[PDB]
Amino acid sequence: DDYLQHSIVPTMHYQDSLPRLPIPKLEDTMKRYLNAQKPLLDDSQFRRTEALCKNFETGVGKELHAHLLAQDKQNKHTSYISGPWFDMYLTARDSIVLNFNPFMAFNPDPKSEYNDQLTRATNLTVSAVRFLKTLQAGLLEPEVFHLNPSKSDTDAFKRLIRFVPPSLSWYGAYLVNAYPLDMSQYFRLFNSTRIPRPNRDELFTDTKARHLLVLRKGHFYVFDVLDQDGNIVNPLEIQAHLKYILSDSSPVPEFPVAYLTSENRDVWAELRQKLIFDGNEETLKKVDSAVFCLCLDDFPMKDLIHLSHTMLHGDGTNRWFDKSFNLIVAEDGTAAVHFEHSWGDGVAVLRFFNEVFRDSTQTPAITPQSQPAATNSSASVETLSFNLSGALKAGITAAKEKFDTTVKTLSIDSIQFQRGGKEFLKKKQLSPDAVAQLAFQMAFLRQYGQTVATYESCSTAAFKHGRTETIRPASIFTKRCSEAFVRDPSKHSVGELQHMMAECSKYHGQLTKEAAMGQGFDRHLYALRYLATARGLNLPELYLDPAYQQMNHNILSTSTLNSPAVSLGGFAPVVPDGFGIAYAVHDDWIGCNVSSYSGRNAREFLHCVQKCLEDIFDALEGKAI
């Protein structure tokens, strides 16, 4: 059949009974905010912030919190954070390219010839459409975080829970230490895009659309991947249509329209209307409503740096950045998902990614020797056309200019630290995630002599319309430990250093568990400021504090994924003088892919991370630094 999974438990079985996202006690939030400020501020700064926190907690903040709590109780079908968080991404005027859109790249098919571009674009496309069909059918397994996979991720549990009504099903999972996740974002994976509008963008979905969008050399093509009866088009016919597209010999347009999706959102909002004005609504709707965007690049990957630039931004002509996601396939079969960040917290994307990798490699629709269906693709594939006015041509040119000059400032590089990874660190009773974060703190201290605002995401999807919470890895413990390793490594015994590491790890573990439980401070404080602004009040003084501005100017922005499907991922810095640090702790090695703009130096940062991990692993092995 057309499904890549056959769950006896309906996909959405737990959604009705998910626990509501807790709002922390304001007292806890103020303390936690100050705890994260400790390593960042001097004494005079810290005292000023502490005084503002007192004022806030006993006054305007106390009042905002009472209203936040009342509002939450009026809105028990959702979470306090979900609306405000969408609103922040969608109201942001900056280009989505680099500022927000990340990528994850697939591992190659382990069968060599299945990495042929045509074969792999066909297999990935068919698997993606299979995912869509499995999701619609409720045949996708629910997303569930198990504490004990061996009792709860079993056919025996699945066979019972399916009989418990959705009003009660979460309780069944809970009693087996299993935590179903929110899946309310999953539908936005497909037939979905972000539409630029003045002031605040729009998320658009059209579930009735049955066609794929394909970009090649900046040209736009559409063809059906689902037939009239809702079945997947014969893979051999999909193969024929993609070969057809890959056979097109037209050069890159003089004004490639995809450039516009990289603009400032107010600029693109104006230019889109002009497209509409010039009779392009119908062509736009075909782009907007496509299942997803498949991008066929006509060059192989030179190296990991080239790979990272290609998947993260490319040359501006061959990605439709607004689309829920772009599935990219290069001439050597290298493949990635570049995705639009505003529409979800990316958990949907990873699930999709993992299933699509598995299905495409273990159950490919076609082989490298498959003969494409004898079809007439010129009839089945429409090559889209935009009616471009003088003003639109001027706008595409200015879009290209802005894009090329920004991308020029972006550097990316990576390391593969091979001395050890997850298995060695677990033996030493340390959280692998905490050790990586420590290394980044330590590296930044070595390179810049500073402790700076650091961001790690944690999913809050165990709750109804849960999103993410910020783990703040820069702690008094990482600061002390980095200072010991960097400023005076001869001052401490290995024993002392080891115990310092255990303290970083334990605190990081604590913050991780609290964040997952909604007990960070970042979302709470943000929701309070949103509510103040939404009620038309002046911004409270707490938020005008330079320490607050600084806490939310995330110089070290970090992200990790743990998947057999993922080769690497990447994202640009979130601030001009920041790093974008994509990392993974594998069993025997640790990977880091780091981006920077002109004001930071990623290459040196990577040498420093290398050195820090070398020192860390030395001290854990019993060796002097």
Side-chain angles (χ1 to χ4, degrees):
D1 58 36
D2 279 341
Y3 312 112
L4 47 67
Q5 207 153 255
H6 300 83
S7 176
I8 55 158
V9 181
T11 303
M12 298 301 261
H13 194 59
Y14 298 112
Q15 303 303 117
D16 284 352
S17 47
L18 297 170
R20 289 158 59 206
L21 182 66
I23 304 177
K25 281 156 82 179
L26 189 53
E27 170 182 70
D28 293 345
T29 292
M30 304 321 285
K31 287 193 197 158
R32 283 163 176 156
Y33 176 61
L34 289 164
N35 283 348
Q37 290 288 19
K38 285 190 206 309
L40 305 179
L41 306 179
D42 69 37
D43 303 317
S44 71
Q45 281 161 340
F46 186 87
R47 283 322 194 268
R48 173 181 50 174
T49 298
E50 185 177 34
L52 296 173
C53 290
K54 286 188 233 134
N55 295 347
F56 188 80
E57 196 186 344
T58 65
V60 68
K62 178 147 79 184
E63 292 301 302
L64 290 163
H65 180 73
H67 288 268
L68 186 79
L69 294 170
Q71 179 177 72
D72 184 59
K73 289 179 196 59
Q74 275 176 341
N75 292 284
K76 296 175 165 179
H77 65 285
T78 189
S79 67
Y80 75 95
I81 196 59
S82 178
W85 207 248
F86 281 123
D87 209 11
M88 192 183 47
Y89 280 77
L90 293 169
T91 55
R93 299 339 272 158
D94 321 74
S95 176
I96 59 177
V97 188
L98 271 40
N99 297 123
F100 308 102
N101 288 20
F103 78 88
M104 46 182 169
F106 290 99
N107 279 142
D109 192 309
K111 301 172 284 315
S112 302
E113 302 188 335
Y114 279 78
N115 297 282
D116 164 73
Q117 178 175 37
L118 174 61
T119 304
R120 210 190 182 190
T122 300
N123 290 145
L124 288 164
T125 290
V126 167
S127 290
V129 182
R130 289 188 109 212
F131 191 94
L132 176 169
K133 287 263 285 163
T134 304
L135 181 67
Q136 291 178 323
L139 287 179
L140 194 64
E141 285 206 9
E143 292 274 49
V144 181
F145 178 95
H146 299 86
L147 284 197
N148 305 298
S150 52
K151 190 170 181 179
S152 54
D153 195 21
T154 64
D155 291 347
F157 177 72
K158 291 154 176 197
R159 281 175 70 265
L160 292 179
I161 198 67
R162 64 170 304 185
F163 284 100
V164 182
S167 60
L168 297 182
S169 58
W170 178 91
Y171 297 100
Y174 183 64
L175 290 162
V176 302
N177 304 259
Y179 301 90
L181 305 190
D182 190 273
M183 295 178 87
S184 67
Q185 292 163 11
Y186 287 48
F187 79 92
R188 291 271 200 216
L189 270 172
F190 303 108
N191 300 112
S192 294
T193 197
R194 176 181 170 163
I195 306 289
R197 298 282 179 199
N199 309 328
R200 179 167 64 241
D201 286 9
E202 162 192 344
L203 296 177
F204 171 84
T205 295
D206 175 23
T207 53
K208 294 175 187 306
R210 288 181 294 95
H211 63 101
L212 176 68
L213 170 68
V214 187
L215 303 186
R216 182 172 175 263
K217 296 194 181 313
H219 304 290
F220 292 72
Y221 312 83
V222 302
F223 65 94
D224 286 347
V225 290
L226 296 155
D227 68 27
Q228 164 96 62
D229 313 314
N231 308 125
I232 300 178
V233 173
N234 178 356
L236 297 173
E237 282 186 29
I238 291 173
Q239 187 192 19
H241 305 150
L242 292 175
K243 176 183 192 165
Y244 173 84
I245 287 163
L246 285 163
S247 294
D248 188 348
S249 69
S250 310
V252 176
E254 220 199 320
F255 303 91
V257 180
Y259 273 123
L260 299 174
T261 63
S262 78
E263 264 282 13
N264 163 293
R265 307 305 291 178
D266 283 322
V267 176
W268 178 207
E270 297 202 38
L271 293 169
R272 193 184 186 265
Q273 280 174 306
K274 292 198 166 67
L275 282 167
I276 298 285
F277 181 76
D278 287 324
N280 296 108
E281 196 167 293
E282 197 185 316
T283 295
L284 284 170
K285 299 268 183 59
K286 293 175 181 174
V287 173
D288 291 355
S289 71
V291 289
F292 61 92
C293 189
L294 172 72
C295 304
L296 302 174
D297 287 353
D298 308 310
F299 52 84
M301 309 291 84
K302 296 175 290 190
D303 48 50
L304 288 181
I305 298 167
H306 179 54
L307 195 163
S308 296
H309 283 288
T310 303
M311 304 317 191
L312 183 63
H313 56 77
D315 72 359
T317 72
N318 213 231
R319 304 279 156 21
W320 190 256
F321 290 113
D322 284 337
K323 206 87 182 86
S324 61
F325 71 93
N326 285 252
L327 177 67
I328 302 151
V329 185
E331 181 215 280
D332 53 21
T334 303
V337 175
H338 172 282
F339 66 100
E340 199 276 310
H341 201 18
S342 75
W343 65 260
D345 307 298
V347 187
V349 191
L350 186 59
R351 179 59 186 285
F352 166 82
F353 195 91
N354 286 343
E355 300 298 356
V356 165
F357 181 73
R358 184 184 72 193
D359 188 67
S360 65
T361 58
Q362 299 193 334
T363 316
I366 70 157
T367 77
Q369 283 79 44
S370 289
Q371 299 303 308
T375 185
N376 177 38
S377 296
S378 61
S380 287
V381 182
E382 165 166 22
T383 308
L384 304 179
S385 173
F386 292 87
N387 178 40
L388 294 183
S389 74
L392 257 137
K393 288 170 184 167
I396 288 158
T397 299
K400 178 176 176 307
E401 186 175 70
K402 172 198 149 91
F403 182 96
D404 287 342
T405 56
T406 302
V407 160
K408 265 191 159 197
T409 66
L410 187 77
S411 302
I412 308 172
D413 215 327
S414 68
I415 60 165
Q416 301 76 51
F417 173 82
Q418 281 161 6
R419 276 191 58 188
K422 192 153 276 162
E423 305 286 32
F424 174 78
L425 298 169
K426 279 169 172 172
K427 289 281 185 172
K428 297 297 175 172
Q429 300 310 105
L430 300 168
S431 153
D433 195 51
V435 169
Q437 292 286 342
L438 168 60
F440 311 142
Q441 292 306 298
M442 200 182 294
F444 197 93
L445 190 70
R446 183 180 168 73
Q447 188 178 5
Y448 294 110
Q450 286 166 338
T451 304
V452 301
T454 304
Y455 188 105
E456 177 185 3
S457 192
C458 186
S459 172
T460 56
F463 306 95
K464 189 62 172 163
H465 297 168
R467 308 294 310 261
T468 63
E469 179 64 85
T470 310
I471 296 166
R472 291 298 183 171
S475 70
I476 45 175
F477 308 101
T478 61
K479 184 178 178 171
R480 282 177 197 158
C481 188
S482 302
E483 288 169 355
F485 268 86
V486 176
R487 305 200 183 287
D488 47 51
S490 296
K491 188 206 173 304
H492 300 90
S493 59
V494 282
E496 282 177 283
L497 297 175
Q498 291 167 354
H499 183 88
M500 295 186 101
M501 288 184 160
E503 294 300 321
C504 299
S505 186
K506 277 182 194 176
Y507 191 67
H508 191 80
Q510 174 189 350
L511 294 175
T512 301
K513 283 171 167 77
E514 292 171 350
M517 293 299 292
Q519 298 292 328
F521 63 88
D522 279 281
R523 298 307 173 271
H524 194 184
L525 293 179
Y526 170 61
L528 297 177
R529 167 197 182 149
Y530 185 95
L531 192 45
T533 301
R535 296 297 147 83
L537 308 179
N538 278 35
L539 186 62
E541 210 192 331
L542 183 87
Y543 301 106
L544 290 168
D545 187 3
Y548 188 87
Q549 306 172 337
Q550 184 174 77
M551 174 63 74
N552 291 107
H553 189 269
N554 293 296
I555 290 167
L556 289 164
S557 180
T558 81
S559 188
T560 191
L561 291 164
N562 297 290
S563 169
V566 178
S567 52
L568 70 156
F571 60 97
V574 303
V575 289
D577 63 326
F579 287 126
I581 302 162
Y583 69 103
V585 183
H586 298 90
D587 281 327
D588 297 318
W589 69 286
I590 293 168
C592 310
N593 198 32
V594 179
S595 62
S596 59
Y597 293 115
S598 302
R600 298 287 177 190
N601 186 328
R603 191 190 316 111
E604 183 62 21
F605 184 69
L606 291 160
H607 286 135
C608 288
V609 170
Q610 177 71 34
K611 156 85 165 186
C612 294
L613 291 169
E614 298 270 19
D615 291 355
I616 285 164
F617 272 62
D618 279 357
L620 288 165
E621 274 165 14
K623 309 185 167 77
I625 293 166

